Amino acid sequence: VTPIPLPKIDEPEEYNTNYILFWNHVGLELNRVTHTVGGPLTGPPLSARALGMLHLAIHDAYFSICPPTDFTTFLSPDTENAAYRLPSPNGANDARQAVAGAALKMLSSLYMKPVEQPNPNPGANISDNAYAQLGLVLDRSVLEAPGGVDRESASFMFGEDVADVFFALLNDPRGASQEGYHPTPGRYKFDDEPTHPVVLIPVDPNNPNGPKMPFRQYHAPFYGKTTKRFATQSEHFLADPPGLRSNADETAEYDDAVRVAIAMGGAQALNSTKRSPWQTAQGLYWAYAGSNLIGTPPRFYNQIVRRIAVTYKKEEDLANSEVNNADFARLFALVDVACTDAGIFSWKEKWEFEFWRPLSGVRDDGRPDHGDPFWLTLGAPATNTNDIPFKPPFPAYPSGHATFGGAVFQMVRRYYNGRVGTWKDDEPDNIAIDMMISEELNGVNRDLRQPYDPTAPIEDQPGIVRTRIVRHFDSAWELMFENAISRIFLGVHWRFDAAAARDILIPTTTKDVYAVDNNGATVFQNVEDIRYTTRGTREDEEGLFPIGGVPLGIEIADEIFNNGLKPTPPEIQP
Ligand code: VO4
Question: Which residues bind vanadate?
Fold first, then answer.
């Protein structure tokens, strides 16, 4: 099997001298490779789950051997419930090997061929080449691991056992099943994307050039309501989106949202598009649309967190510093677990409301003076490919990116408060980062003129190269904000999918109608002045709930952090 030539990562090579970071890196490599070959754990929610599982196993393997003082392990060795009982070291005192065994076992269980029955139905769609490519990554990581991997050591074996417990407990084999689901057409209702209503998939994944069959995909419609949560201590809910249920009367907000959607998220050459070149860059920067050699958003968030971690480490030595090892092991567990749970609840709410995407909303609006039956969005970039590929669609409210970002960055804020600076938990921080490059705009990746060739490095394939943009951010508050609004710039999310329009836009004299500049472009509030305070109602529940993905993510992160990273009580699991 010819190894897929992977493009160089924009990050100091010193990072991987630290074994916690190295293993995180391997998880990210598998993330981008699986999205290049169509292997297991694709898509936003499941790819996040994989990283959450990986870091939970690493967390407990390390902290069992080098026990912490201000917190404990996720699972305990004295648990009565066998499923939640952590293995005991019993002599194993090599943390490096414990982490290695944990990481290797977990990733192998996650990405290697589920020969044990699961191959049928569940895995019945993944080619042997996909597994082969993923195996190569795993195989060389063992040889690339700093300090080597001693598979014979007791510590390595302990790590393996830790992984087994977590895999058995949290793996969700049928997480992406769509069996039984079908859209329910109507105003505000999610249905097949008008630009990609059907896909022609090969009857045999091992013969991609053989007979195809028409298929209609929906991304994980039952996952959110059935899957096991990681560390959340309760169920989270969002207000009804404008136009539905208790907020069906919020028509002014909806109408203005349609207006903003057209102006800010339309295709580049449309006369109605008012989005600026810089805003277009902001939209693509956070994309990570599950593309070839790129992967999904959870990968980018980890790339960013890696930089933050190293920039604010307590000790200079990246290779042999237990202070750094513990710090990184704890940070990533917190972040990736928050990311996992964020994916669960955003998906749960997405399929609960089944709110339609701006593309369908604008086209099917029906009012001659409001809609545009021929509107086109800038859309999620089809990076490293020569066309606009069909990707399993999912409802709009709330934004997955917004929820992931809210959770990941609020967690980082809670973790570094009082260490990098001091701030109120709900106000802007000072966790700044420099030289942050997105693979969507790195001067290497591109929009190909012909089909992607996995036997040749991206640089040798003709196409339009993405402009290299090196960014600097002043705070995790900014990262959180921009990550959310980037979806408005692409035209894939409504303004309320991110947060309440009242909390992010500049108001006018007319309620629910917001300010636009000279050229008609929407004006946003300054990041420093943004507070996610506006809540709304739910038809099915009493009280005020958060609006949009960002607020939802913040809440999930605060809850997990406040409880010190504790398992979801089994009694409240679905
Ligand atoms: O991943 V969205 O749900 O922000 O398109």
Answer: 350, 357, 399-401, 487, 493
Pick the CATH number of 1-175 from 3.40.50.300, 2.60.40.10, 3.30.70.860, 1.20.144.10: 1.20.144.10
Query: CA nearest 486: which of 379, 354, 359, 391?
Result: 379
3-state secondary structure 380-433: CCCCCCCCCCCCCCCCCCCCHHHHHHHHHHHHHHHHHECCCECCCCCCCCCCCE
Q: How far is the centre of ligand 1, averaged over its atoms, from the C-alpha of 400 (Å)?
A: 4
Header resolution in angstroms: 2.2
Catalytic residue among 219, 236, 401, 472: 401
Pocket test for ligand 1, best of 492, 496, 550 (most atoms within 8 A of CB): 492
CATH architecture of 176-574: Orthogonal Bundle (1.10)
The 3 state secondary structure assigned to 40-69 is: CCCCHHHHHHHHHHHHHHHHHHHHHHCCCC
- Method underlying the structure: X-ray
Residue boundaries of the structural domains of the chain? 1-175, 176-574
Backbone angles phi, psi at 200, to 5 degrees: -105, 100
Q: Does 371 count as an annotated binding residue?
A: no
Is 219 labelled a binding residue? Answer: no
487 labelled ligand-binding = yes
Tell me if residue 401 is catalytic.
Answer: yes
CA of 45 from ligand 1 middle (Å) equals 11
Q: 401 C-alpha to center of ligand 1: Å?
A: 5
CA–CA gap between residue 7 and residue 500 (Å, rounded): 39
